[PDB]
């Protein structure tokens, strides 16, 4: 019967909780209370980027940290030259309902996906002058989320069918399938090393999956609601999670438990698009009160507020070199933030 | 000032050319009407789609009526969280809701009672606080042969009216309209469909014209 199996699972969960609590001698706040604070931050936008006519859900600049891919609900993928405020390519999407963009480390492929249950890969550096759909991938029974780019031949995505997939670019067939989530899966940030990845489901669970082995290794439950944002802390030993409630949580990888959380009583709205700087000192998250928030990712205290937007911020990212921060909201406006 | 680096001169212009295309699509999207189709169970969704199409994601419809390109999106093929992707359909011209009259007898709580909460969630949704809603009462002919045999008291214990279509249908329409908690800013266009005198497309066109008048008034000052 299943009663003894359920009891054994409960006992295993209790043992896991006891082991997690055993290695809780001190918290991160106590350690970081003796370090210099980040101080006041007054980053301002120096860009216009006025070419969209719908809500934007697009980030993942690329390796060059100069070209930025952008998508909206009008079914157009635009490549922005951030340095000169220019448009490179305009790809008309077959499905106008899309929330996913990737630029690939090579920089010659652009991936998109949404409620069409279709992952579209478009080739950029082609002999012709247009942008052709390099491949169409199907097999998901839910809205697509994230099109991360393990290699030029492998792409990992998530869907609302509580599964994650890893497909091959050359062959349009399923290669690796992950089925361990009980809710919709998004937030698939692809590590600093690309050897691993994590998925944030809608049942307050963040699960790390082995790319080669194809099995789950660690499960993190510290939220009280759905998680819709993730990062990987380019050091590679922790990751940040954002939920629809106004709180963010930093889960350590080796410790396999939460270190600390960023929250405030003055904010009640949601959180999207969690990203990290190249050093991990700052955490930037697009909140749902028409502005972004920058937190100190070591102690607790806030660092700054980026209010240069009119609608809810949906996408937000930082370049590989950490030069500037891109932010896209629902007002069809993309902003680039820099220090002074 | 800096000669614009020659090649970049040909670059920005290309970007401008893209702009020339982009707005050309955007304006094309301005004069296009987008409608959202929803339903709890079968609700005669396939029948309505087939009827209006002659004139695993989203089954879009490209049908046109009197120089007005209507867009119909079906979201019943997705089995996932509703509110995760319900904000993408905000700002549509109108939303079409289909329910079945003959669903008060079948169960799996009856189907119509299950549709009531869906209708309440859609009408009271924050993203749809200013969009007119069109409701279709399908399976009208089945009600005629079902009400005589199956009394309406099973679904409505607080009903004591005459067991006639002209009264039961009116009561059902009123009950569906009572769920509109924001009637001061939204309106419900309720209509019955049948396999004859196909005025359903004409009714949808009239509702679209009404909501277009509403939107134009919002844009042009008054109301």
């Amino acid at each position, epitope marked *: 019967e299943l009663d003894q199996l359920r009891q054994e699972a409960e006992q295993l969960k209790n043992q896991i909780r006891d082991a997690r609590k055993a290695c809780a001698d001190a918290t991160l706040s106590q350690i970081t209370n003796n370090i210099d604070p980040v101080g006041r931050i007054q980053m301002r936008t120096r860009r216009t980027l006025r070419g969209h006519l719908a809500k934007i859900y697009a980030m993942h600049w690329g390796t060059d940290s100069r070209l930025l891919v952008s998508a909206s609900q009008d079914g157009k993928l635009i490549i922005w*030259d951030s340095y*000169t405020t220019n448009k490179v390519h305009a790809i008309p999407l077959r499905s106008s309902w899309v929330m996913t963009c990737a630029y690939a480390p090579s920089g010659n492929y652009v991936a998109c996906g949404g409620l069409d249950n279709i992952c579209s890969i478009y080739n950029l550096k082609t002999r012709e002058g247009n942008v052709r759909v390099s491949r169409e991938l199907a097999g998901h029974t839910g809205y697509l989320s994230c099109c991360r780019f393990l290699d030029d031949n492998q792409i990992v995505t998530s869907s609302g069918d509580t599964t994650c997939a890893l497909w091959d670019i050359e062959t349009g067939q399923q290669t690796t399938t992950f089925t361990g989530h009980t809710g919709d899966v998004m937030s698939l940030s692809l590590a600093p090393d690309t050897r691993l990845f994590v998925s944030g489901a809608c049942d307050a669970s963040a699960k790390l999956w082995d790319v080669r082995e194809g099995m789950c290794r660690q499960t993190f439950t510290g939220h009280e609601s759905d998680i819709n944002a993730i990062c990987f802390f380019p050091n590679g030993n922790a990751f940040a999670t954002g939920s629809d409630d106004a709180t963010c949580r930093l889960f350590d990888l080796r410790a396999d438990q939460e270190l600390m959380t960023y929250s405030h009583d003055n904010i009640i709205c949601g959180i999207t698009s969690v990203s990290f700087s190249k050093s991990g000192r700052l955490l930037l998250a697009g909140y749902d009160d028409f502005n972004c928030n920058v937190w100190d990712a070591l102690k607790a205290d806030r660092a700054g507020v980026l209010a240069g937007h009119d609608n809810r911020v949906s996408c937000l990212g930082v370049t590989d070199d950490g030069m500037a921060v891109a932010t896209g909201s629902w007002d069809s406006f993309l902003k680039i933030w820099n220090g002074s | 000032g800096c000669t614009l680096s*020659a090649e970049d001169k040909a670059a920005v212009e290309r970007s401008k*050319m893209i702009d020339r295309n982009l707005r050309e699509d955007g304006e094309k999207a301005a004069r296009e009407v987008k409608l959202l189709l929803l339903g709890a169970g079968e609700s005669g969704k396939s029948t309505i789609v087939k009827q209006m199409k002659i004139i695993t994601g989203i089954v879009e419809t490209h049908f046109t009526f009197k120089d007005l390109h209507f867009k119909m999106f079906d979201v019943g093929g997705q089995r996932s969280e509703r509110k995760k992707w319900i904000h993408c359909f905000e700002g549509v011209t109108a939303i079409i809701f289909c329910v079945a009259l003959s669903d008060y007898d079948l169960v799996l709580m009856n189907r119509m009672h299950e549709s009531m909460k869906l209708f309440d969630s859609i009408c009271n949704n924050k993203w749809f606080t200013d969009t007119s809603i069109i409701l279709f009462l399908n399976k009208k002919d089945l009600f005629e042969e079902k009400i005589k045999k199956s009394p309406l008291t099973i679904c409505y214990p607080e009903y004591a009216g005459s067991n006639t279509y002209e009264e039961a249908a009116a009561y059902i329409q009123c009950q569906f309209e009572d769920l509109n908690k924001r009637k001061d800013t939204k309106e419900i266009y309720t209509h019955f469909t049948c396999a004859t005198d196909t005025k359903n497309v004409q009714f949808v066109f009239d509702a679209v014209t009404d909501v277009i008048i509403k939107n134009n008034l919002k844009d042009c000052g008054l109301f």
Partner: single-chain antibody
Amino acid sequence: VQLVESGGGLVQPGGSRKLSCSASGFAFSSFGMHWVRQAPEKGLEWVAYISSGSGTIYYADTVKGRFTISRDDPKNTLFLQMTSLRSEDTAMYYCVRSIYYYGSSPFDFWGQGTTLTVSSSDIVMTQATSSVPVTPGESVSISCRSSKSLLHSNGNTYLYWFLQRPGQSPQLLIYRMSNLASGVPDRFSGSGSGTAFTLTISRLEAEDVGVYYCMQHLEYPLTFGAGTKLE
């Protein structure tokens, strides 16, 4: 991708004639087009250029105000008409394609050429060596010089290298003196500094001899180089 041109022949001086360049295999409507004239024994020369969408059109100094150009995207063709021909216009005309975006490769593919015969402050580029023997397996260097500093105030140079095989149209080798062209062998390389550029060929094999041309792109009146020939 294919570019084929027609309209050649022998014409008396003072006449008018049009050349038609038709492209099959790529998007004509989004590509700028250039015309390059080659003398029977001298080097390549620029004629005119028309941008995508017929936005900006430029002509050479010797042909300004006399030649005319046009395109038809639905027909995917480029027409260039000349009036009042002279003896100095006797050259083979190449219709070439280019695109201008971040990390683009202008002048990537050239045309085939048409034989036209007549019965009767610009930045200059000079190559010190015009001919030098080569051997199958040794490394060689080709030097190009410019009268102006091609290093624009953005971080990149506008040098191009073109190879003309003995019987084939010129083909791009490297662009911007630092990026390799598509489909070209990795043996070729380029480097240098302001007003002094070099191109290095290492592990050279057979079936690669021809004429080498260096291009500046700082300002529209593009001027070819003298030409380096290896045999």
